[PDB]
Amino acid sequence: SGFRKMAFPSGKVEGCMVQVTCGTTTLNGLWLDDVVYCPRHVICTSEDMLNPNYEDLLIRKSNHNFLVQAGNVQLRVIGHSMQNCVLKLKVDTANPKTPKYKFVRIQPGQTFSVLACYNGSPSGVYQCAMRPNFTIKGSFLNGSCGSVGFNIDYDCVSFCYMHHMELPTGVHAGTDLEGNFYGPFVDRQTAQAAGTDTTITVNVLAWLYAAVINGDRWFLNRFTTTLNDFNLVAMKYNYEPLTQDHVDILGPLSAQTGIAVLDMCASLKELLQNGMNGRTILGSALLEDEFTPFDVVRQCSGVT
Amino acid sequence: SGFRKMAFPSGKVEGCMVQVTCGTTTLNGLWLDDVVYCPRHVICTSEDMLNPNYEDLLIRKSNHNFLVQAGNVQLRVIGHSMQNCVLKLKVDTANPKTPKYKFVRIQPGQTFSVLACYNGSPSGVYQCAMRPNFTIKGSFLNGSCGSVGFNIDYDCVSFCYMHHMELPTGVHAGTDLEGNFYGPFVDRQTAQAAGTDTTITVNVLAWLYAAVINGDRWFLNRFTTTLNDFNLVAMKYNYEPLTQDHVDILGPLSAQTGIAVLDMCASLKELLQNGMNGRTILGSALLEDEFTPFDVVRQCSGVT
Ligand SMILES: COc1ccccc1O[C@H](C)CNC(=O)c1cc(=O)[nH]c2ccc(F)cc12
Ligand SMILES: COc1ccccc1O[C@H](C)CNC(=O)c1cc(=O)[nH]c2ccc(F)cc12
């Protein structure tokens, strides 16, 4: 029993972290096979970030201008190319620690672990969720760019995020491993405001199921609702609309606890309307939305 | 910017996890040099757990009864001994992945990362704190015993916890790596209730400093207090008494923000007396106490 914001074991990703320096800028790179992936803004000076023309900036860079260091040893850069907002630095050595991997582009509401790195070195690991406004609420300081987000399925690492920037509001934006930003963000130091950070309803319900499984049941009520009635309340509280797809995904949690999804929706509705009344659920005084239904099942079953 | 419940990168510990089986019981072991450490209750059947005599149970066990598997390969057990509540299984092969390490016994209020494991395999990593009642609020299922808690200082892993049991109240108890339980808990399936789970005051203040550093300042007030006045309020709210040692440890956070420790204590006092009023601090609706002053500095500076 017990429920924690758990991240995947980070070892497989730690073995891929390298340092990339170009001129006076140093950030993190991801070394997989003979390619090192890093944010293209490594070629920019702080002045360039205001209005960078990446293709023009890249013309002044050669293979020898990209310094790649794996631990204390230097990798030889034999090629470089820009794919969207990432640079792919071809090195002459395949990473011997390359795990089985995939590059996946996640949907909002999906969770992942982040291995925060500085100078190619891991500092920590934490669990994130792609917000519905395509930002993440991370913990990143200067030098953290190129730190990656990932999920692990037994021995396969699915990389889904690469950190690129912090918006003026303290929230984070980045790309998938093909260099495409999540959301409308650009790798430029300009006015980029995030949209509404709505709550991931299906995740909150999954977390309420986790609470019931772990003994916290005070919020269970005598009511039920419909998808349309629940959604009227969800709209009022800036919660994402719940679809039949979400109800289907909550099927196994519903089966395990014996609590119908719409009954859990009615519990959630009363919690939204009445608040927690100074009470807690799984040690939290707010409704947690960064656990997917898959995370709840995984944690509650012990998938390794 | 941003503040997260961050765990240490777990790779160095993942390389030490092994599976230990004795009879029909399988749990996790920690392989460091040529010794595998595991909870002594691996020798018990579920029936034995009600009133086990470990010395007597151990007489019926030989080296060949302890099956140790590292990944898919079997380790040869050449010796076994019981130290307090842990078994030390001497194997014929030194773990080639043994990091630099120490065994430390932590004090209540100190935090650590847990690498939850099942069958010698890592499932996830999360950040914990040794509660003032010597329990931890973890996430452990059947088979998680022998999972360890640790801190990392650059390349040295300080192991501080080994998981042994779940109390009937859903909280967790375990030992340091010398096999001594934290608190008064015993490795027996009996009525073991935990004492008062008081709040780790110095950690809450460290977290309030983290909030100020990251932009959340609404709770800062026009007041100050004294250690004795603050402690009268702390006693009323089941917070640990704040000492001058704690004030000294908060010195660097006080210096960084320019907010005197006693002024932050007065902010904390008003938060205890008036509540959050439906507001949040670093995305939490309660006062977080599982970040030490060292964790706040580390996260806010980027120690790798
Ligand atoms: C406005 O910057 C950009 C605009 C678009 C694209 C990239 C930008 O980022 C520049 C290149 C490098 N950024 C960081 O290293 C960085 C990342 C972070 O998440 N938090 C930080 C906190 C403090 C700090 F001094 C720096 C950071
Ligand atoms: C009362 O048990 C003991 C009393 C004293 C000492 C050890 C005991 O633990 C037995 C040997 C094995 N325990 C687990 O595997 C276990 C650990 C956990 O943290 N959560 C669990 C959730 C469900 C479940 F079925 C088992 C566990």
UniProtKB/Swiss-Prot annotation, chains A, B:
Crosslinked positions (Glycyl lysine isopeptide (Lys-Gly) (interchain with G-Cter in ubiquitin)): 5, 90
Protein localization: Host cytoplasm; Host Golgi apparatus; Host nucleus
Stretches of the chain found on the membrane's Cytoplasmic side: 1-304
Active site: 41, 145
Start and end residues of each Peptidase C30 domain: 1-304
Catalysed reaction, written as an equation: TSAVLQ-|-SGFRK-NH2 and SGVTFQ-|-GKFKK the two peptides corresponding to the two self-cleavage sites of the SARS 3C-like proteinase are the two most reactive peptide substrates. The enzyme exhibits a strong preference for substrates containing Gln at P1 position and Leu at P2 position
Effect noted on mutating residue 205 to V: In strain: Zeta/P.2
Effect of residue 90 to R: In strain: Beta/B.1.351
Effect upon mutating residue 142 to A: Does not affect ability to cleave and inactivate human TRMT1
UniProt-reported outcome of changing residue 49 to A: Does not affect ability to cleave and inactivate human TRMT1
Regulation: Inhibited by pyridone-containing alpha-ketoamides compounds 13a and 13b. In turn, alpha-ketoamide 13b (tert-butyl (1-((S)-1-(((S)-4-(benzylamino)-3,4-dioxo-1-((S)-2-oxopyrrolidin-3-yl)butan-2-yl)amino)-3-cyclopropyl-1-oxopropan-2-yl)-2-oxo-1,2-dihydropyridin-3-yl)carbamate) inhibits SARS-CoV-2 replication in human lung cells. Inhibited ex vivo by michael acceptor inhibitor N3. Inhibited ex vivo by compound 11a and 11b.
Protein role: Cleaves the C-terminus of replicase polyprotein at 11 sites. Recognizes substrates containing the core sequence [ILMVF]-Q-|-[SGACN]. Cleaves and inactivates human TRMT1, preventing tRNA guanine(26)-dimethylation of tRNAs. May cleave human NLRP1 in lung epithelial cells, thereby activating the NLRP1 inflammasome pathway. May cleave human GSDMD, triggering alternative GSDME-mediated epithelial cell death upon activation of the NLRP1 inflammasome, which may enhance the release interleukins 1B, 6, 16 and 18. Also able to bind an ADP-ribose-1''-phosphate (ADRP).
Subunit structure and binding partners: 3CL-PRO exists as monomer and homodimer. Only the homodimer shows catalytic activity. Interacts with host FBXO22; this interaction promotes the proteasomal degradation of nsp5.
Protein name: 3C-like proteinase nsp5
Name of the gene encoding the protein in the UniProt record: rep
